[PDB]
Symmetry: D2
């Protein structure tokens, strides 16, 4: 046999960091979950019980904490790039570092209409994520995303004109509920190394803000022909707004809300124009995916 691929490291590393402005008293918090997996000249750890090539996962954990103490943890694209660059530079035999970061929301509280200096709320389970692949001699590949952004519109969604054959029961509709959990990813141009990442730092927060704003506005305003058509509009607008993005990917469940025919009970009218009460369906769910790039 032989090792065809191998990577290893530490997953599920929870990290908090606080910044304290000792002049204003304003504190700012950051919380993430980090995974770092390494690749390199490590096959003998698998084939010959050769632990000498292993940077222990415990040491990778220590390194995450140390790196967070010594550097900014925001934007996550930068932190992940710093962290991944450390492992390929420090260890000659390590040739790739794959850094995944999930950023958790801690939004400053407003108390009596004033932002509080040191109190925060988890205002959504929505995450901001990065995948940063630092590959020796091949630069830094970053995928940024938002996920867990759960939305619903109560009208201005349609679905008609689809293929109809002997497997089809679905009725056409000109007015339905549309709800999803948005998972949106933007793939950056390859960066040559950490200097190039640092040169673009403001673009990371700005492009996440653009992606989120476009997602929400297009969802709210598009009189949707399908999930497919609406998500494509989101992607095209994000590409138009940031030239350093190569592709935008969406992965969207269609979280169905079924009408409930109540006409069997006292002639109650609860379908079509009279539909008020619906049954949210936990499963199954449509799942619609697109990757959009330039033409």
């Amino acid at each position: 046999s032989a090792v065809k691929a191998a990577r290893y490291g530490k997953d599920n590393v929870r990290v908090y960091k606080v910044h304290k402005d000792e002049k204003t008293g304003v504190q700012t918090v950051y919380e993430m979950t980090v995974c770092v997996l390494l690749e390199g000249e490590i096959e003998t750890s698998y084939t010959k019980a050769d632990n000498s090539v292993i940077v222990a996962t415990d040491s990778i954990k220590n390194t995450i904490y140390i790196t967070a103490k010594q550097n900014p943890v925001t934007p996550p694209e930068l932190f992940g790039s710093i962290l991944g660059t450390h492992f390929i530079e420090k260890y000659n035999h390590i040739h790739a570092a794959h850094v995944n970061i999930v950023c958790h929301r801690w939004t400053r509280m407003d108390i009596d209409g004033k932002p509080h200096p040191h109190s925060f709320i988890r205002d959504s389970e929505e995450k901001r994520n990065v995948q940063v692949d630092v590959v020796e001699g091949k630069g830094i590949d970053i995928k940024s995303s938002l996920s867990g952004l759960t939305v619903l519109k109560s009208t201005n969604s349609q679905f008609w004109g689809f293929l109809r054959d002997e497997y089809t029961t679905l009725k056409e509709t000109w007015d339905r509920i549309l709800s999803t959990d948005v998972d949106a990813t933007w793939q950056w141009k390859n960066f040559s190394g950490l200097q190039e990442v640092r040169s673009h730092v403001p673009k990371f927060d700005a492009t996440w803000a653009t992606a989120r704003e476009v997602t929400l506005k297009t969802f709210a305003e598009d009189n949707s022909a399908s999930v497919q058509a609406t998500m494509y509009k989101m992607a095209e607008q994000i590409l138009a707004r940031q030239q350093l993005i190569e592709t935008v990917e969406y992965s969207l469940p269609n979280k169905h809300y079924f009408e409930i025919d109540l006409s069997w009970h006292k002639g109650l009218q609860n379908t079509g124009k009279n539909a008020e009460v619906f049954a949210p369906q936990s499963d199954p769910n449509g799942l619609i995916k697109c990757t959009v790039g330039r033409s």
Copy 2:
């Protein structure tokens, strides 16, 4: 043997309702998960295979949908009271209905600074709940709550002066992180029936808003001596603000954030005044509970 207690019904009934103002075009959505369990002269269904006393759980489900079509679903205290009253009035042999409702957030989106007429975001996993126990001849007992309200403050929490003996390792602290998931319950005066509930309807939304506001402000502003001391302040203020509440209950995890001593690595200082990077602990967690009533 004999049946000492019995209740049965339908759990996990997902319900959506929309309101459409056909004059303004503004739509408003409501989503909940409902459980209804009944009690009464039902023991023979258990002891003698006598299904004649069973209102089928499927029929209880149907009834939840029908009741949502025929009545307001807000405030949940009212909906639950309507629903529970239906079962004890409709069925002579049913003597109690226990209605639990979890309300899911669908907050109207603001698009370009204007509230959108029909688009919503799940802006938090925080729930608003009710437990409505409708007991024939004994009125309606309501417990209202908020849950899943996750908060953190980065300073202005202390914990010193606790008992120290041979089981104690914990260091006293005058400056720590405090984070919790708030579960706060207010117990209403017994209501004699549905008329009395309806007579107090505006108090339900107002008291939930008070409970939430007091929770957030007291958490943010109290230089906390302990979870115990802070939560008591919340409860006392809520009781002072609504005379129709008899008790307030809090159940709070202390979601610990541990300092990380990095002095083994290059003398890095990350404890005490220099603490910036922390390890959030998933488990174990302190769990602190109080029920507060009038003196």
Copy 3:
């Protein structure tokens, strides 16, 4: 205001223990999750920032580990009794200790038909639990349970003869699927203290084994008239087999499996006697509860 009830402590304490027979080489493992909440003369911690009455939750955690090192962790009824007795004896002002234990399965592997001395499998997510309430001057109240025991029978379940009115759509059936997650609790006679618990130690494992055996056999063999009727048979048999049990409680979801009418497609027959393919329903679910005691 005043404190009407209060309890506090440490939840979600994960504990492993190994026993090593250094003569045979056979190792045996135990894994649990423990919660200990204390009550007593603690109100001033809530009302006056008086931490002197607080046995820190961190110290409660330490105590759980220490107690596991110094005593058997099995049966859980005994461990919980030891642990709870410690807090009310050690601390004059602590008057109750509420100990919850969830026991996780680690079943010894059989390798080439021989039990392995030190390798284990999590052979089910089924738990064995205890709730041990140690109350100074009032002894030790134990509730034992099994939970998460998920079963299905493909026939020999019926449901007919239930109440039919204008809310009813459910068809009677003489042959359906029945599936549930068993939560079964047996409540012991009050014990006067730890000596009395210890005097009954073999009964704990024997009664858990009886409860499990009766559950499985009655589920498998009863041509069920309803969940209600079948669960009552389980409870009555357990009471008949252990006189030191006062009550048995079951809480059972009816995890519905719906027929799928396929007659719209090529006349396919998939209902009634021809039903082969079903749609498991995630929600809603019936929920049926009984507490059975002696007559």
Copy 4:
């Protein structure tokens, strides 16, 4: 912009099927969760609101049920191949079908030492899965796996000889706990179509049984130098036992169990040879991955 990749379909389709031997009375059950995502000449559904190219996800759901009624659902590799072949054959413009199946355990109960004809237990949360990619003109690519197989050994695991530098705190050990959740995947030789899959049908159940047996025996018997070394032994043995497998992949968390130093309390000895009570760590966790192929 332009569509670079697109796939869509129905996820989370729960399916049960029963087989009834009407001669012996023995019933056998199967339960799965299915996802089917299609690719093909579908870009205009995204770019031009052209729903004519969409086989509705609802219709894909119907098709899963119909296919389960008309064909065996076991082995899952065969069912998935049938299902995926249907979509690329039925629809000229659909060129790939990606079928994921998770198989849930329903193990026949033994009652009084005899297998019961129609009662089953979910004896583990362990899954058997397939990923079947049916690509028009490119055959059928199958990845089979087992997942959620949770194991622990209490000794005969070591970890020493790893890289030690200024980031390292981990102590070498010659005797530790090892616990993981096994995710093991075997990748089949490409099949030309459904006939070739059918020609190998017995190999699917046999190779899953081999993979599971080798996993358990190697875990139990290897005096492990590392997760890396042990998992490689598993993979090499599986490749040696089935020539129609090209690669074996393992993904293994190292679910850490930490010693607890209790020497601060009464000199209690709970480390090294005296270690009995451990703290299972929920997070972080090592994560170790290998893909092994022939040399």
